[PDB]
Design an enzyme around this catalytic site. Structure first.
Site, PDB file in Angstrom:
ATOM      1  N   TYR B  49     104.841   0.837  17.091  1.00  0.00           N
ATOM      2  CA  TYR B  49     104.620  -0.545  17.536  1.00  0.00           C
ATOM      3  C   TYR B  49     105.168  -1.578  16.553  1.00  0.00           C
ATOM      4  O   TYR B  49     105.310  -2.757  16.891  1.00  0.00           O
ATOM      5  CB  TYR B  49     103.126  -0.807  17.785  1.00  0.00           C
ATOM      6  CG  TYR B  49     102.526   0.070  18.865  1.00  0.00           C
ATOM      7  CD1 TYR B  49     103.347   0.782  19.747  1.00  0.00           C
ATOM      8  CD2 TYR B  49     101.144   0.234  18.972  1.00  0.00           C
ATOM      9  CE1 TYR B  49     102.818   1.649  20.695  1.00  0.00           C
ATOM     10  CE2 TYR B  49     100.593   1.102  19.932  1.00  0.00           C
ATOM     11  CZ  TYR B  49     101.440   1.814  20.783  1.00  0.00           C
ATOM     12  OH  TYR B  49     100.929   2.738  21.669  1.00  0.00           O
ATOM     13  N   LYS B  78      99.314   6.572  15.324  1.00  0.00           N
ATOM     14  CA  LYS B  78     100.007   7.718  15.877  1.00  0.00           C
ATOM     15  C   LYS B  78     101.244   8.074  15.075  1.00  0.00           C
ATOM     16  O   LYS B  78     102.016   7.201  14.685  1.00  0.00           O
ATOM     17  CB  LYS B  78     100.439   7.408  17.318  1.00  0.00           C
ATOM     18  CG  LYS B  78      99.342   6.818  18.203  1.00  0.00           C
ATOM     19  CD  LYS B  78      99.843   6.631  19.642  1.00  0.00           C
ATOM     20  CE  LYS B  78      98.766   6.009  20.547  1.00  0.00           C
ATOM     21  NZ  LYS B  78      98.595   4.563  20.286  1.00  0.00           N
TER      22      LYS B  78
HETATM   23  N1  LIG Z   1     100.155   6.980  23.417  1.00  0.00           N
HETATM   24  C1  LIG Z   1     100.961   6.416  24.278  1.00  0.00           C
HETATM   25  O1  LIG Z   1     101.963   6.970  24.690  1.00  0.00           O
HETATM   26  C2  LIG Z   1     100.698   5.013  24.816  1.00  0.00           C
HETATM   27  C3  LIG Z   1     101.628   4.435  25.785  1.00  0.00           C
HETATM   28  C4  LIG Z   1     101.365   3.120  26.278  1.00  0.00           C
HETATM   29  C5  LIG Z   1     100.239   2.380  25.832  1.00  0.00           C
HETATM   30  N2  LIG Z   1      99.363   2.998  24.868  1.00  0.00           N
HETATM   31  C6  LIG Z   1      98.211   2.174  24.360  1.00  0.00           C
HETATM   32  O2  LIG Z   1      97.269   1.787  25.427  1.00  0.00           O
HETATM   33  C7  LIG Z   1      97.302   0.334  25.622  1.00  0.00           C
HETATM   34  C8  LIG Z   1      97.255  -0.095  27.068  1.00  0.00           C
HETATM   35  O3  LIG Z   1      98.555   0.132  27.746  1.00  0.00           O
HETATM   36  P1  LIG Z   1      99.476  -1.054  28.312  1.00  0.00           P
HETATM   37  O4  LIG Z   1     100.188   0.153  28.716  1.00  0.00           O
HETATM   38  O5  LIG Z   1      99.640  -1.642  26.960  1.00  0.00           O
HETATM   39  O6  LIG Z   1      98.089  -1.600  28.911  1.00  0.00           O
HETATM   40  P2  LIG Z   1      97.415  -1.894  30.331  1.00  0.00           P
HETATM   41  O7  LIG Z   1      96.233  -1.718  29.594  1.00  0.00           O
HETATM   42  O8  LIG Z   1      98.602  -1.135  30.799  1.00  0.00           O
HETATM   43  O9  LIG Z   1      97.836  -3.448  30.148  1.00  0.00           O
HETATM   44  C9  LIG Z   1      99.085  -3.906  30.610  1.00  0.00           C
HETATM   45  C10 LIG Z   1      99.051  -5.413  31.019  1.00  0.00           C
HETATM   46  O10 LIG Z   1      98.134  -5.888  32.110  1.00  0.00           O
HETATM   47  C11 LIG Z   1      97.686  -7.212  31.825  1.00  0.00           C
HETATM   48  N3  LIG Z   1      96.226  -7.254  31.739  1.00  0.00           N
HETATM   49  C12 LIG Z   1      95.337  -6.906  30.754  1.00  0.00           C
HETATM   50  N4  LIG Z   1      94.064  -7.156  31.045  1.00  0.00           N
HETATM   51  C13 LIG Z   1      94.137  -7.708  32.318  1.00  0.00           C
HETATM   52  C14 LIG Z   1      93.113  -8.171  33.162  1.00  0.00           C
HETATM   53  N5  LIG Z   1      91.800  -8.179  32.911  1.00  0.00           N
HETATM   54  N6  LIG Z   1      93.488  -8.681  34.403  1.00  0.00           N
HETATM   55  C15 LIG Z   1      94.844  -8.724  34.789  1.00  0.00           C
HETATM   56  N7  LIG Z   1      95.876  -8.271  33.978  1.00  0.00           N
HETATM   57  C16 LIG Z   1      95.472  -7.769  32.747  1.00  0.00           C
HETATM   58  C17 LIG Z   1      98.481  -7.707  30.620  1.00  0.00           C
HETATM   59  O11 LIG Z   1      99.572  -8.482  31.072  1.00  0.00           O
HETATM   60  C18 LIG Z   1      98.929  -6.473  29.898  1.00  0.00           C
HETATM   61  O12 LIG Z   1     100.160  -6.638  29.224  1.00  0.00           O
HETATM   62  C19 LIG Z   1      98.496  -0.162  24.717  1.00  0.00           C
HETATM   63  O13 LIG Z   1      98.344  -1.482  24.189  1.00  0.00           O
HETATM   64  C20 LIG Z   1      98.616   0.917  23.657  1.00  0.00           C
HETATM   65  O14 LIG Z   1      97.808   0.677  22.529  1.00  0.00           O
HETATM   66  C21 LIG Z   1      99.587   4.309  24.363  1.00  0.00           C
END
Ligand SMILES: NC(=O)c1ccc[n+]([C@@H]2O[C@H](COP(=O)([O-])OP(=O)(O)OC[C@H]3O[C@@H](n4cnc5c(N)ncnc54)[C@H](O)[C@@H]3O)[C@@H](O)[C@H]2O)c1
Ligand SMILES: NC(=O)c1ccc[n+]([C@@H]2O[C@H](COP(=O)([O-])OP(=O)(O)OC[C@H]3O[C@@H](n4cnc5c(N)ncnc54)[C@H](O)[C@@H]3O)[C@@H](O)[C@H]2O)c1
Lengths: 319, 319
Positions: B49, B78
């Site tokens: 990140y 990670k």
């Molecule tokens: N290990 C992995 O491969 C991996 C991959 C992707 C993400 N992650 C982690 O998990 C987290 C969540 O994934 P994303 O994929 O980031 O997250 P979501 O939790 O996929 O969030 C995506 C989006 O939805 C919106 N959002 C958030 N809360 C909302 C709400 N209450 N109402 C309407 N829209 C809303 C925002 O615009 C946000 O950018 C990441 O920040 C990261 O830390 C891990």
């Protein structure tokens, strides 16, 4: 007339073989002998099938008649689940060698990326799902690579020509390729129009690994075992897409099903249980499927899996 | 109150966290600080990140004001792909430790069961898909277990409290459980109504592995990346099933998507980009979905995956 495929190990493997699963022990010898008379040279066996002595009898009978020599016969076998612990691998292979009555096997595959608790051969053989404790499944902590190294040593000893794996998903094959000295020469997986797994096939082939398809006829093999899932599935033989293509080339739906795999470099080992089928199943490379044919057949893919350890004890192999 | 989940490691892990992916460097500190004020205690970070230094700034500020003690913050990081080779593992964890400005991380996960060729921190950091040769992908032959053992040593050394994996399919998780001394405490996978993988969840939970879901809002976060697949996908927010259920309870679609995971024992780490979302994303456990609600949502499962290494370089992780 039956094309050979050059394995990564340097050895040739017939692209069309004879399946020995559910090959009754009483007539397995005679059937293997007849298959050899019909031209088959590769026999796909397994410790789990419990008919390796008979398969052995059939090959030996053919050899003794001067029909073939050991070197012209390709014998495939598979290390069953209770024998993954390195200290038991050679034990299992010797059992196979003794039953088949040969000094080496051409291909020895890890039947499943699953390690059941060891069960001495004298207590039950083949053990099947028996894990030494009634009807309970019991497992042992043996990483795949440990098993693979034991296999590599046996190739050095001369007891196996080529080694491979069966029922391995992409992630697992990738990882094994990371610690393997001798690259798995073969990936044997369920492959039919209802479970095409095109990405796994592509990855494996690009990696120099040869694919052998099993259950090329889909649910049929499992319908014979009264499996509910297979029974509920419309057959490939009566599928409109397969029949239309078969009619287009004046071939049978079975021939199209085997050619569909063959034309893409995938080896087949159909189970032939009728003299007629023996011939049909090794005479299908008489036409070519077109790009449109492949696209039409491609639509049948629905990720329907008939051979799944998830069904035995929720083993997450394909999840 | 954000419920806790006791990990197999013995340590408690907040069931609701603050995602740090795409968290801007210029504002990451202030954003984490605000989240801490709003009640968040777990922060899901990652070397990839490129903002752990700033995530650390935010935490330090909260501590320096007496808002919380290090003891109270749960930091997840990670191990990126270029650092699987055991000799590079501790150096990568150190870089993470310094950036976050702490002595240990609460959870360190193997980000992907993929091993890119090492790239020195000074040459490029985070390396992303860079492998040391222009735009080409270059891999290292390092089995997962080698990497896992390195991680175990680091736990013994007090630099990590709990270890786990991410983006691991079932067969790979199983093989690892066979070689691990310290069992993986967490499995973090993409998880939402279009990719439910119920058997993987079931398998892991029964093995005592805790599930942390990511991308709980489906195509949403990948749309923010102008990803083709995600752009051609009906949003979960406007889906009739989700809309209907949300209305029925006077909840937002987002609260229904988060509770759908929570009620099933799955931890969540939503990316909150607005003050109101920040509050709502940690206040949804006020209702329970019914058996029918679950049944209706279950019908959405189509195994549609937005985060797939197959897209990077045809890496067979999920095939
Ligand atoms: N290990 C992995 O491969 C991996 C991959 C992707 C993400 N992650 C982690 O998990 C987290 C969540 O994934 P994303 O994929 O980031 O997250 P979501 O939790 O996929 O969030 C995506 C989006 O939805 C919106 N959002 C958030 N809360 C909302 C709400 N209450 N109402 C309407 N829209 C809303 C925002 O615009 C946000 O950018 C990441 O920040 C990261 O830390 C891990
Ligand atoms: N490694 C593994 O997990 C695994 C699992 C299953 C099978 N295998 C191997 O691969 C082979 C695959 O064979 P299979 O048993 O799954 O079945 P197929 O080979 O799927 O044949 C299944 C059935 O269809 C019929 N059939 C065969 N040829 C036909 C033809 N020309 N026209 C009409 N019907 C025909 C027969 O009744 C036969 O029993 C096995 O014999 C075995 O050697 C390996």
């Amino acid at each position: 007339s039956i094309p050979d495929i050059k394995l990564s190990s340097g050895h040739l493997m017939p692209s069309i073989g004879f399946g020995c699963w559910k090959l009754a022990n009483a007539t397995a010898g005679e059937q293997v002998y007849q298959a050899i008379k019909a031209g088959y040279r590769l026999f796909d066996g397994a410790e789990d099938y419990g008919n390796e002595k008979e398969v052995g009898d059939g090959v030996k009978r053919a050899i003794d008649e001067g029909l073939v020599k050991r070197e012209e016969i390709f014998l495939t076998s598979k290390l069953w689940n209770n024998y993954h612990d390195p200290k038991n691998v050679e034990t299992a292979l010797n059992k196979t060698l003794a039953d088949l009555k040969v000094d080496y096997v051409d291909l020895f595959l890890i039947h499943f990326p699953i390690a059941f608790k060891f069960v001495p051969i004298e207590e039950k053989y083949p053990p099947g799902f028996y894990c030494g404790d009634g009807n309970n499944f019991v497992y042992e902590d043996v990483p795949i690579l440990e098993t693979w190294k034991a296999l590599e040593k046996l190739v050095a000893a001369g007891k196996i020509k080529s080694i491979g794996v069966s029922n391995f998903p992409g992630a697992l094959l990738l990882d094994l390729l990371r610690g393997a000295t001798i690259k798995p020469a073969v990936l044997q997986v369920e492959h039919h129009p209802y479970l095409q797994q095109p990405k796994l096939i592509e990855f494996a082939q690009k990696a120099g690994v040869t694919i052998t398809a099993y259950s090329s006829f889909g649910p049929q093999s499992f319908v014979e075992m009264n499996q509910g899932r297979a029974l509920n599935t419309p057959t490939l033989f009566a599928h409109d897409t397969i029949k239309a293509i078969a009619a287009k080339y004046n071939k049978t739906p079975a021939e199209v099903l085997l050619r569909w795999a063959a034309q893409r470099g995938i080896a087949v080992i159909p189970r032939s249980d009728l003299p007629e089928r023996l011939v049909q199943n090794r005479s299908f490379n008489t036409f070519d499927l077109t790009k449109e044919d492949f696209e039409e057949i491609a639509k049948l893919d629905i990720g329907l899996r008939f051979n799944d350890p998830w069904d035995w004890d929720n083993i997450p192999i394909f999840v």
